[PDB]
Each structure stands twice: as C-alpha cells, then as structure tokens.
C-alpha cells in the first residue's frame, strides 16, 4: 500500500506552490493529476474534499492555460497525455461502479443500447488525443526531454491494455511500437523482449504470420542481452519458444513444433506460483488446442500420444481449462464484483496493466469457446458463455464487444430454431452499429474509413450479422433475400482481408507486403460456402449454386488443416450429390420385395478429416452414408460406421465431465478415457483407424446381451430420411446389418413421425376443454390413433426384420439352413450371399409368418420368381415350432428422431426386456464400472428400503396427493417431501445416498434439480420420474436431444423410467400405482422391465398414457 503517503506528500506540493505564475499553474496541474491518480482507486474524499473527475477537469483547464518555454514542450505534451489517460481511467471506473450498483438494484439485454451511447464519442477521443500527444513526443530522433521516461513507458503499457479491452487492436499495435522505441532508448532489455512478444501475439491472433516471425526473432535477439538466471529470463525464453511452436503450427512444421511444445510444457518453470506465469499458462493451454484441432494425418502417432498424455483430451477441454485460469486471475486482481453480482486493486504498476489484459483475454477466450462449442453441437453451453460475456461487457459499457457477443447469441438462437429472439438480437445490433458509425453499413465502398469498416472487429461483427440474417431468411421460407445476403458475405470477406492487410502495413511500416494474407475471416467464408452448397442441393436446377461446390472445395482444401470440418461438410455434400435403383442395395444382401467406389473413398477421407473432433450432425450423416455405400461389402466396417453415428454430443459432454472428474488428483476413469477418446487407436490405412478400432471395441460386448441400433438414414442434411439401418451386434456374432427402405411402401417413415406430432398437438389443444363430452371424445379419438401407429412400426417399417430384434436362436438349429439356403438362393439370383441372416431369425420359428417368409424370400432371392420364394417358404415351414427362447436383455439404440416413437409396445417386443442406451461405448463403460466395484445397484440390487420421493412440490395437484399419501408414507424405510419444494441439499442426497427416486409432479423437477446439479454428483439410484415428457429428448431443430435423462445416465444411473409425451393425472397415477405394487410386491430378484410391461395395461387409455414410460440404461432388479 502507498495511499496515505502519496496523499499527504501530493497535498504538500498542492499547498507548496502558487498559481498566478505560468510555472505555478503547470505544477498545480501536475499535482492535481497525481491527486486524481490516488482518488481514482482509493477512498480519501472525506479527507480530500475533492472527486477524481473534478480534480482532473481542473488539471485539464489549467494545462490548456499554459504556454511553454519552447524547450519544455515535451514535458507539457507528456503531462497532457497522462491527464487525458487518467480522465479516461477515472470515467471508466465510475462507469464500472455505477454498473455494479445497477446490478445491485436489479437482482436485461435491453440496456445493450440503453448505454448513453453519447459519451462513447468523447471518451474514445480522450484516448485518441492521448495517443496523438505521446506519438508526437516519441516519433522524433532527438532524445525525449521528459523528466521521467519510465512513467511514459508504464503509461504506454496501460494505454495498450485499455485499447485491447475496447476492441481496437490496430491502435494497440502503434502503442506497443512506441513502447519498443521507449524501451530501446532507455536501454532496458527486458521491456523490449516483453513488447516484442505482445507485438507477435497480437499479430498472430490477427492472422499475419510473416511479420510475427520477424518480431519473434527481434525478441529472440533481445533475449541475449540480459542475465541468464533471473525469473525474467526463464519466462521470456519460455514465451519465445511457445511462440515458435505456434508459428510452426501455422507454418506447416508441426513435427518440430510439437517437440518445442513438449519442452515448454515439461519445463517446471510453467508451474511456479506467479501472476506472469499464470498468464503464460493460458497461452500454452490455447496452443494445446490449436494442435488438438489438427487431424491425425498432419503428425505421427507417437507425437499425438505424447501430447495427449499430459492431459487436454479434446480441444474444448483446453479452452475451458483456460477460461477457468483467467477467471481465477480476475478474482486475484479485481475482486469479484465484475464477474458476479453476489478485494482492493492494489495498483503498483504491473497490476494496472494486468487488470485490463486479463479482462481482454477473458473476452477473447470466451469468443473462441462460443465459436468452437457451437460448431460441435453444444449450443446450450455456447449460449451460457455468451450470456456471461454479454453481462461482463454490459457492465463495462463497451459497445463493440456487446455487438460480437450479440451476433454470437443470434447465431446460436438460429441453431436452436427460434426466429423471434434471433431477430430481436440482430436488431439490437443494428442500433449499436448505427451508434458506432434495413442494414445501412452495406453499399459502402470496398475501401473506406468508416468506423464499422476501418476496424476489423466491427467488420467481422457486420459480416456475421449478415450471415445470421441470411440464415433467418432461409429458415422463414423467404429465400432469394437470404441467398443474396450470403452472396454479400462471400464477396465482402476477401475485401475486408485486403483492408486489414493494408492497415497492418500502414501501422508496422514494413516494405514488403504480407507473404501470408490474414486468416481471421476464413471461417466466415467457409460457413457461407457451406450454406450456399446446402441450398444448391435442394435446387439442382441452378448451375451457379452447383459450381459453388467446387469453389468451396478449392477454398477449403487450399488451406489444410485450417478448415477441416468445412471440408468434411463439403465432401459429404459432394458424395450425396454424386449419389443422385439405389447403389446401396448392391452393397447389402437384401432389397425390399465406379461412382460408388469413389464416393466411399471420399467419405473415408472426410471421416479422417473430422474423426478426432467431429461435429455431431456432420459425423452422423457421414457415418451412415458410408454405411449405405458399404453395406455387407465389409460387415465390420458397416457396423462400426452405424454405431459411430448416434449420440456424439453425449460423448463430447462425457469426455469433458471425465476431465473434470480426474481434475478433482482412478483406473476405471483412465480406461473410460481410452474408450471415449476419439484417437485411442493404432495408425494405418482405413481398417487400422476404422475397422480395427471398431473390432477392438466390438470384442467387448457383455456375453448374453444384444445391442441393436436403429439409425434413420438421411437423404439430405436437415430433413428426416426414408432409409433405416439396423445392426445386430453380439459377442462371437459377425455384424448383421441391413436396410429397411420405407419410402416405397404405403406408410412412409415421415408419415409416422408427422402423425406423432399431429397427435401431440391435438392433445395440447384438447388439454383446455371444459365440456366432459368434448374432452372425453378427444381422448378416445387419440388413443385409437396411437394404437394404430404402434402397429404401423411392426407392420410397415421393420417389415421382415423383427427376428433381428427378437433374441436370435443360438441353438444348433439354424445351422441346418445357414448353408442350405445359400447353395440355391445364390443360384437363383442372390448378389451378396450373407450367412448370418439365416440364423438370426430361427428363434420362434412358429411365430414366423408366411407373409414374413414371402418378403424374406423375395429380398434374399431375386430373379427367378418360383424358387426365390418356394424354397425359402418350404424350408422355413419344415422348421416350425422348433424351440423355445432364452433370456437375453436388449438395449435398443435409436437416433435423434426415432427416439420419440414408442418402440417398446411393438407387438413383438412386449414380453422381452427392452431398454434404451445412448450409445455402445456407454454399454461397455457400464461393464468397466461394473467390474471395478462401482455402480452398486448393478452389483447387489435395488434395496426396497432405500427410496426417496418428491410428491407435489407445488400445491397444484390435489388428486395426486389424495391418492399417494399413506401409500408413499407407510412404505417401510422411505423418506420424502410433500407440499413444500425440497431444498437443493436434500434432493442431491436422494440421488447419491439412496437407490430409488420416485417423482410425482410436473415435468422432471427441472426446477428443484437441474441437470447441472445431477452431473456434479454420481447417481446410485434408479430414476422412476413420472411426469410429462420426463424422458423426452426435445429435438429443438437439427440439434440432437436434450433432457434430464442424458445427464442421469452420465452420472451412472442404472435405469431411467420417464414418460415420453404429456400425461394427465389419473391415468399416470394408475400406472405408477400398478408398477410400484407389481415390482415391490414381487419379491427379491424381480426385473423392473417385466413389471413395466405389465403396468402398461393399467391406464384407461392404454396407448396414450399407457405406452409413454420408457427405460434408459441397463436392467435393474431387487436383491
């Protein structure tokens, strides 16, 4: 602390000098600026009787009333520059304090434009004039005549930090160049190195690497003129090596760059407890993600394992690992008010600059995190980060950053398919843009000096706004306008790059123009190209849209691996374009009753391009399209691809959660990391990374359980397709995979999925009818339709392939025909004579029907119409009522759109135990946890005295409480809450301490227990959540599902019983009472799935409130 000292001593000079003389007023102004410096970060008013702004305003008036001696001009320049600088700092601190007070009053997004937006034109001019004065001081050959050039250097550092916060990197570059000049003239070799490194860092973040390399060696040269033992030398050398690693990552020298990065990481210096190193760790953690975004072809395998060994599995983790360190540094420096609305600054020179630097780095890291997370498919997390950034920017009242964090939110809202909120956000931005300078920033000259056009950040904001506006145009159905907006984006990006290049040359004064153009706007161009190609797909008539595909392909391939996921999207578009009978049928062994060769190779290339960090939708479309083009040509490959196309965002979230688990430093954890890692495999051709990695995973199924996948094969990215893929994976069982096209039948795969939505809307409409006659008519007219639908799935979609779902007969009885019906079927016309399709069906041979046999024969046997059926029919007839089936639990896996259809009541899967897991790696991680003494429910059983209930959290449902009061209270050894909303501690305890959680209320209790609290605990209790849509993964657009179930399963929940659609009171109460008495009265060792299959017949409408409960997980039972 230096407060009282400087306070008293500055007062001494305040009273020690007169004012009438020209020197006196000057001295008083300097004394007033030093007084403002103290009053700006210390509370002494009561003892000073002056405010920071009043003091600095008086100092400015006095300073503008001074005439120099023609030899002290420089000192007046410096004093005026510092006075303006501290006016800006004190005004900004007043803004921050009143913003904190505003959040104190209110404890939004309408104040985004409420910013006075009238001071931003004077406050910026303060800093502009300060820079002008300091430049005029420090752009001349003669040595500056200022008394103290150290203070000038420090003030230039603070100017650079503030200019970085306000999103003006261009002027921060000039400030840092003047800092380098001051450093060289003052003969301090540490500050020159520090300055040179920031000049490189800023230059590479913009995207010009040549000048970045020039400055890195300029820094390397300065690194020699200083002692080789101090902390300064270690930190500067480590920073120089890290920048070299990043440069090699940019200059296609990854092989040596990774070695430099390994040296950087392994050096114990980046562990010592210091704020300078705490900042250095952020840069290395960002660089680890630049490497982790690389494909598996631009490196060796040993370097990849070396990089992953220390940590940082998927790129997303590294960036969250950074934003945490940045927030921790903020808490260390500026207290905690600026981050949450729930410490003294301690200014000693370094702290002042570090404060603004850490704020700027927080904002930049949040920007990168939002972009990357939204790209993968985690839109919710991106929105969370965006809202945090918007709050921080609103507190500081910086319009440009609010604009970037507003266009990001608009893009995410478009991703979630919410047009109104997206339009509002895009309109909030046109206000900010208008203040900064129908869209009016368009029609500008390619070259101009507009604030929205001379600043790269504002140009990027405008381009992203136009891109999202084009997207919202296309989504609303109003095309043409959206396509033109996308053309504007595609045209504008290169010219913006050209202007940034010219600006960089103007600032840095290098002779030769940049060898490499900036790559900051390349992502915008790639996304625009993707949108144009996708639009061209649905309009094949146009040829300009067709040629766009090639243009985007050259654009993405010309910069490898800078834009890999866009290359994968364009490759999938290219393959689906070359697609349009289907060539797929010649790749499986059945049909309903070359170009492909190159297509499969291109899909293989795209798979490699994104396998390590795949976007969800893109991967799912690719994997299943590759399965279509492959079929039974390589059954293992087809099974791998099909099972690699379901629940990908689930796997991203599980890897991130696992990293958090390990951070809060075990063997099961490590093996689970290896299982979920997108790169844990040996290198090689296609099989080694694909078919092999697959087989390595496929040799892991628990013996006695069938794992089927029902993936709806698409036809065009975005819409529901009319092809369905089925893969029966089992131990010692070669993959049996086929197609079930329903686009040639009467009940197409979209008819069922639209009738489901029609029934849902009818239910929502009838929910508010008073007349008993009208209400009951509607319920009884919807139950019949749902009953019709559940049988459509068995009658039309699965067709002659329900045996592949029913437990296959592992008895030695199929063998008699598994080769008998090949020696004639292949002769009659079979193209690919598979051998497993004749053993997966023999179980329940009596249940096999002659019309089933007809399709099974025609598809297996084309050409000659007589033998084709006759042989298969007589053979199957001879094998009728052969044997009885065993017990084999089933874990059906369904895609994002096939999860909502009731697949459990299908009149073939009624008796058998059927559940539903997100994916296959989940099924095997269940065995890992089940072997390392974890998940005690699957080890011992569900203790009937370890159940917790939450009934009627809000006093709304009197019928429920009336029914389940004594029954839920008299139960031996149970505890719960009725009437009152349970406190958070209590509910977390239930899922963690007990074994069963019966919820009777609205929804899933996302009001008293959100998925966030559930992920932050381990689930030891089976979830029986009986409320509307309690297990429904809402498909809010093209995005995958979302709900509480996908976060109970990540906590280790054995089973999860929740309703799929909305339910009323009495029927679901009947279901709950039936299931509970059935399961808790059966006795020890009683499967839950069996009694659910029984309780389905309790509701009055046995198809609209009886077929709703589904199960997620592995079989549970009593002890």
């Amino acid at each position: 602390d230096t407060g009282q000292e400087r306070f008293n001593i500055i007062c001494d000079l305040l009273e020690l000098s007169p004012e009438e003389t020209p020197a006196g007023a000057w001295a008083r102004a300097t004394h007033l600026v030093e007084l403002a410096q103290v009053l700006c970060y210390h509370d002494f008013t009561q003892q000073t009787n002056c405010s920071a702004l009043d003091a600095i305003r008086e100092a400015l008036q006095l300073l503008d009333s001074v005439r120099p001696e023609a030899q002290a001009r420089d000192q007046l320049l410096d004093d005026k520059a510092q006075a303006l600088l501290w006016l800006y700092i004190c005004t900004l601190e007043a803004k921050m304090q009143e913003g904190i007070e505003r959040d104190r009053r209110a404890q939004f997004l309408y104040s985004n434009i409420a910013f006075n937006l009238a001071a931003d034109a004077a406050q910026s001019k303060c800093l502009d004039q300060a820079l002008a004065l300091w430049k005029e001081l420090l752009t001349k050959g003669q040595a500056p005549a200022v008394r103290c050039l150290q203070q000038t250097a420090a003030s230039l550092q603070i100017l650079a930090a503030l200019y970085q916060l306000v999103a003006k990197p261009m002027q921060a570059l000039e400030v840092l160049l003047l800092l380098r000049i001051v450093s060289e003239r003052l003969k301090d070799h540490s500050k020159a190195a520090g300055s040179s490194c920031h000049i490189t860092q800023l230059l590479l973040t913009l995207g010009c690497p040549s000048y970045a390399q020039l400055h890195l060696e300029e820094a390397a040269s300065s690194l020699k003129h200083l002692d080789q033992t101090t902390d300064t030398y270690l930190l500067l050398s480590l920073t120089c090596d890290l920048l070299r690693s990043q440069l090699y990552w940019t200059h296609q020298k990854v092989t040596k760059g990774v070695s430099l990065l390994l040296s950087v990481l392994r050096d114990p210096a980046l562990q010592k407890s210091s704020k300078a190193w705490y900042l250095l760790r952020v840069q290395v953690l960002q660089l680890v993600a630049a490497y982790l975004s690389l494909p598996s072809n631009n490196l060796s395998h040993s370097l990849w394992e070396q990089l992953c060994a220390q940590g940082w599995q998927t790129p997303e983790i590294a960036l969250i690992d950074s934003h945490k360190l940045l927030r921790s540094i903020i808490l260390l420096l500026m207290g905690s008010d600026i981050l949450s609305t729930q410490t003294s600054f301690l200014d000693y020179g370094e702290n002042l600059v570090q404060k603004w630097q850490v704020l700027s780095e927080v904002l930049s890291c949040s920007e990168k995190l939002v972009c990357h997370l939204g790209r993968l498919g985690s839109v919710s997390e991106a929105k969370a980060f965006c809202l945090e950034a918007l709050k921080l920017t609103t507190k500081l009242q910086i319009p440009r950053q609010c604009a970037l964090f507003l266009v990001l939110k608009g893009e995410l809202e478009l991703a979630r398919n919410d047009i109104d909120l997206c339009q509002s956000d895009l309109q909030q931005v046109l206000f900010l843009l208008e203040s900064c300078t129908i869209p009016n920033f368009l029609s500008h000259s390619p070259t101009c000096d507009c604030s929205l056009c001379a600043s790269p950040v504002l140009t990027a904001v405008c381009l992203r706004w136009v891109l999202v506006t084009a997207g919202v145009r296309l989504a609303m159905g109003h095309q043409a306008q959206g396509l033109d907006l996308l053309q504007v984006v595609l045209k504008g990006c290169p010219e913006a790059a050209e202007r940034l290049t010219q600006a960089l040359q103007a600032s840095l004064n290098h002779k030769t123009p940049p060898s490499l153009v900036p790559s900051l706007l390349d992502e915008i161009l790639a996304q625009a190209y993707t949108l144009l190609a996708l639009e061209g797909l649905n309009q094949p008539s146009n040829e300009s849209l067709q040629k766009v595909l090639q243009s985007g392909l050259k654009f993405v391939a010309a910069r490898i691996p800078h834009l890999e996921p866009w290359r994968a999207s364009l490759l999938l578009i290219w393959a689906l374009t070359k697609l349009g009978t289907q060539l797929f049928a010649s790749s499986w062994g059945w049909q309903p009753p070359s170009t492909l060769d190159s297509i499969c190779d291109s899909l293989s290339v795209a798979f490699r391009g994104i396998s390590h960090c795949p976007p969800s939708g893109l991967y799912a479309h690719l994997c299943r399209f590759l399965a279509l083009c492959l079929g039974h040509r390589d059954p293992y490959a087809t099974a791998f691809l099909v099972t690699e196309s379901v629940s990908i965002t689930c796997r991203h979230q599980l890897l991130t959660h696992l990293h958090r688990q390990l951070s809060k430093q075990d063997v099961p954890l490590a093996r689970i990391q290896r299982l979920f890692s997108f790169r844990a495999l040996e290198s090689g051709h296609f099989p080694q990374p694909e078919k092999e990695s697959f087989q390595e995973r496929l040799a892991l199924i628990p013996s006695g359980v069938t794992v089927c996948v029902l993936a709806l094969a698409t036809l065009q990215p975005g819409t529901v397709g009319n092809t369905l893929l089925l893969t029966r994976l089992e131990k010692d069982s070669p993959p049996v995979s086929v197609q079930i096209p329903t686009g040639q039948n009467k009940l197409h795969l979209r008819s069922v999925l639209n009738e489901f939505d029609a029934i849902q809307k009818a239910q929502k409409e009838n929910s508010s009818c008073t007349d008993k006659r009208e209400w009951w008519t509607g319920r009884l007219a919807l139950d019949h339709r749902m009953e019709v639908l559940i049988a459509s799935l068995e009658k039309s979609v699965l067709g002659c392939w329900k045996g592949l779902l029913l437990p296959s007969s592992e008895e030695p009885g199929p063998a008699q025909e598994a080769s008998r019906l090949q020696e004639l079927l292949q002769d009659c016309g079979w193209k690919y004579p598979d051998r497993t399709l004749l053993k997966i069906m023999l179980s329940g041979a009596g249940a096999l029907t002659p019309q089933d046999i007809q399709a099974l024969a025609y598809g297996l046997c084309p050409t000659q119409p007589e033998r084709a059926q006759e042989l298969l029919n007589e053979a199957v007839g001879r094998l009728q009522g052969l044997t009885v089936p065993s017990n084999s639990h089933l874990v059906l896996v369904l895609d994002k759109d096939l999860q909502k259809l009731p697949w459990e009541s299908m009149p073939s899967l009624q008796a058998l135990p059927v559940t539903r897991l997100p994916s296959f790696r989940f099924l095997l991680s269940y065995s890992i946890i089940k072997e390392y003494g974890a998940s005690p429910v699957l080890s011992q059983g569900v203790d009937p005295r370890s159940t917790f209930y939450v009934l009627n959290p809000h006093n709304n449902l009197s019928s429920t409480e009336e029914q389940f009061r004594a029954n839920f209270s008299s139960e031996a050894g149970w505890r719960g809450v009725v009437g009152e909303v349970p406190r958070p501690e209590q509910v977390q305890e239930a899922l963690t301490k007990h074994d069963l959680y019966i919820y009777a209320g609205h929804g899933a209790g996302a009001r008293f227990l959100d998925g966030q609290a559930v992920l932050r605990l381990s689930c030891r209790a089976v979830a029986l959540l009986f409320g509307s849509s309690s297990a429904a993964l809402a498909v809010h657009g093209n995005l995958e599902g979302a709900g509480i179930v996908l976060k109970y399963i990540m906590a280790g929940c054995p089973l999860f019983l929740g309703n799929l659609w909305d339910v009323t009171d009495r029927d679901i109460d009947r279901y709950t009472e039936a299931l509970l008495q059935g399961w808790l009265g059966a006795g020890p060792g009683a499967p839950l799935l069996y009694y659910v299959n029984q309780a389905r017949q309790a509701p009055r409408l046995k198809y609209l409130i009886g077929a709703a409960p589904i199960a997620y997980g592995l079989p549970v039972s009593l002890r």
Binding site: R773, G1003, D1062
Partner: peptide, 29 residues
C-alpha cells in the same frame, strides 16, 4: 352420438406440465 353415455363419464383431468465452475483461488505471486 354416445352424448347421453358420455354424461356418465368422469369430469376432465388436469395436465402434469407447468405451462409457465466457481473460479479458484490462485496462490498469490
């Protein structure tokens, strides 16, 4: 039709729908 029979049916029900990391402390330099 069935209007007189629907009189004996019970009154309509009600739906079961509402229809409505901490930054760490780094060691000081």
């Amino acid at each position: 039709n069935l209007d007189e029979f629907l009189k004996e049916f019970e009154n309509p029900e009600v739906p079961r729908e509402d229809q409505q990391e901490e930054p760490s402390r780094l060691q000081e330099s």
